[PDB]
Amino acid sequence: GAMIESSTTIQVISAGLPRTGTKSLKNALEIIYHKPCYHMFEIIFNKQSDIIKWQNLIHDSHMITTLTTKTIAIYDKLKELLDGYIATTDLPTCGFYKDLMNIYPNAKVLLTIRDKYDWLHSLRKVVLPKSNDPWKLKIEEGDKVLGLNSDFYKLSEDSLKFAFQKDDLNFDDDQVLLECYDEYNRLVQETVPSDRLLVLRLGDGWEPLCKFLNVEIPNGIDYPCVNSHHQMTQLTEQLIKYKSLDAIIHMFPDLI
Ligand X SMILES: Nc1ncnc2c1ncn2[C@@H]1O[C@H](COP(=O)(O)O)[C@@H](OP(=O)(O)O)[C@H]1O
**Which residue's CB is nearer to ligand X, number 11 or number 227?**
227
User: Within 10 Å of residue 191's Cβ, how many Cβ atoms?
Assistant: 13
Establish if 184 lies at the interface with ligand X (CB under 6 A).
Answer: no
Among 169, 187, 215, 225, binds ligand X (CB under 6 A): 225
When asked if residue 23 is in the footprint of ligand X (CB under 6 A), the reply is yes
Stretch that binds ligand X, among 12-20, 69-77, 95-103, 233-241 (CB under 6 A): 12-20
Q: Are 18 and 35 in contact (CB under 8 A)?
A: no
Scanning 13-21, 56-64, 71-79, 169-177 for contacts with ligand X by CB under 6 A, the matching segment is: 13-21
Interface positions, 89-128, toward ligand X (CB under 6 A): 118, 122
For ligand X, which residue of 11, 14, 22, 156 counts as binding (CB under 6 A)? 22
What is residue 199's DSSP assignment?
E
Q: Long-range contacts for 168-176 (Cβ within 8 Å, ≥24 apart)?
A: 171/128, 171/130, 171/131, 172/130, 172/131, 174/120
Q: Which H or E run includes 23?
A: helix 22-33
Q: Which of residues 237-256 bind ligand X (CB under 6 A)?
A: none
Q: Does 185 bind ligand X (CB under 6 A)?
A: no
Region binding ligand X by CB under 6 A among candidate stretches 7-15, 76-84, 140-148, 219-227? 219-227
Question: Which span (48-56, 154-162, 210-218, 226-234) binds ligand X, by CB under 6 A?
Answer: 226-234
Give buried/exposed letters for 67-88 (b at 16+ CB in 10 A, else e).
Answer: eeeebeebbeebeebbeebbbb
> Contact at 8 Å (CB) between 147 and 48?
yes
233 binds ligand X (CB under 6 A): no
Give me the phi and psi of 25, to 5 degrees please. -65, -40
Among 203, 219, 220, 246, binds ligand X (CB under 6 A): 203
| Residue selected from 12, 13, 14, 19 as contacting ligand X according to rule CB under 6 A | 19
193 vs 203 by CB, closer to ligand X = 203
Q: For the CB of residue 121, give the shortest distance to ligand X in the complex, in Å.
A: 7
Residue 129 interacting with ligand X (CB under 6 A)? no
Where are any strands of DSSP class E within 75-233?
87-88, 108-113, 197-201
Closest CA to 109 of 5, 206, 191, 203: 191
Please work out, in degrees rounded to the nearest 5, the angle formed at the alpha carbon of residue 64 by the alpha carbons of 63 and 66.
140
Distance separating the N- and C-terminal Cα atoms of the chain:
30
Q: Please list every residue from 50 through 89 that binds ligand X, using CB under 6 A.
A: none
Binding residues for ligand X (CB under 6 A)? 18-24, 118, 122, 202-203, 223, 225, 227-229
